[PDB]
Amino acid sequence: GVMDVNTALQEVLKTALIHDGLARGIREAAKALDKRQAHLCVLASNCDEPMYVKLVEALCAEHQINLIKVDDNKKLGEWVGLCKIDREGKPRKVVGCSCVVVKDYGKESQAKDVIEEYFKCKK
Amino acid sequence: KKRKKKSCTTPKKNKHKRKKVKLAVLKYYKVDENGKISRLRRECPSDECGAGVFMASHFDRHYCGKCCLTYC
Ligand SMILES: [Zn+2]
């Protein structure tokens, strides 16, 4: 592979946007985990709610679903797509996201391969 | 003819304002120190409302808000 590990999530998130396979927010993520239609989850390390982190971690662990950590919620939301593009091209309007669930993968081999390799290396 | 106003009725009928609840997901689950998760709210027996659609713990009944199913 050529793409970096941390920068390879953008392709998957964009393709899940295009194919409508994203559960955004804690309520939708928890509902998807209970429905166990989830494939993987994305968690934001920077947050002010320890109960949020505990609930997401326990739901991911007890449903044998892999979890990914992200630096901050604003970058996570910018990846997710809850932003508007200015004339120059920067996202002045960003709404942070603390948890994301990928319900359907995008039909991209390169994007999935690196994430699967990282998950296998973690295990 | 010209329209008469006649503006006098019950002073103001107010519109229902929905309650703002912060982090309503958390109260559905209880957590032990070992890391276990227990679902406080019952799960509806309907087809669509089977896993993540919890019911309502009213003082004398159980109510699913997604399909109006009610139990004692
Ligand atoms: Zn129901």
Swiss-Prot record, chain A:
The reply on keyword Coiled coil is no
- Domain of life, per lineage: Eukaryota
Which of UniProt's keywords are assigned here? Acetylation, Cytoplasm, Nucleus, Ribonucleoprotein, Ribosomal protein
Q: What is its main location?
A: cytoplasm
Give the protein's function.
Part of the small subunit (SSU) processome, first precursor of the small eukaryotic ribosomal subunit. During the assembly of the SSU processome in the nucleolus, many ribosome biogenesis factors, an RNA chaperone and ribosomal proteins associate with the nascent pre-rRNA and work in concert to generate RNA folding, modifications, rearrangements and cleavage as well as targeted degradation of pre-ribosomal RNA by the RNA exosome. Subunit of the 40S ribosomal complex.
N6-succinyllysine PTM positions:
K120
Which protein, by its recorded name, is this? Small ribosomal subunit protein eS12
**InterPro entries named in the record:** Ribosomal_eL30-like_sf, Ribosomal_eL8/eL30/eS12/Gad45, Ribosomal_eS12, Ribosomal_eS12_CS
Q: What are the GO MF terms of this UniProt record?
A: RNA binding; structural constituent of ribosome
Q: What organism is recorded for this protein?
A: Homo sapiens
Pfam families, per the entry: Ribosomal_L7Ae
Q: Name one GO biological process term.
A: translation
Q: Which PANTHER family has this protein been placed in?
A: 40S RIBOSOMAL PROTEIN S12
Q: Is Ribosomal protein included in the keywords of this UniProt record? A: yes
Q: How does it assemble?
A: Part of the small subunit (SSU) processome, composed of more than 70 proteins and the RNA chaperone small nucleolar RNA (snoRNA) U3. Subunit of the 40S ribosomal complex.
Q: Which residues form a coiled coil?
A: none
What are the subcellular locations of this protein?
A: Cytoplasm; Nucleus, Nucleolus
Report the sequence similarity comment from the record.
Answer: Belongs to the eukaryotic ribosomal protein eS12 family.
The record's Gene Ontology cellular component field reads: cytoplasm; cytosol; cytosolic ribosome; cytosolic small ribosomal subunit; Golgi apparatus; intracellular membrane-bounded organelle; membrane; nucleolus
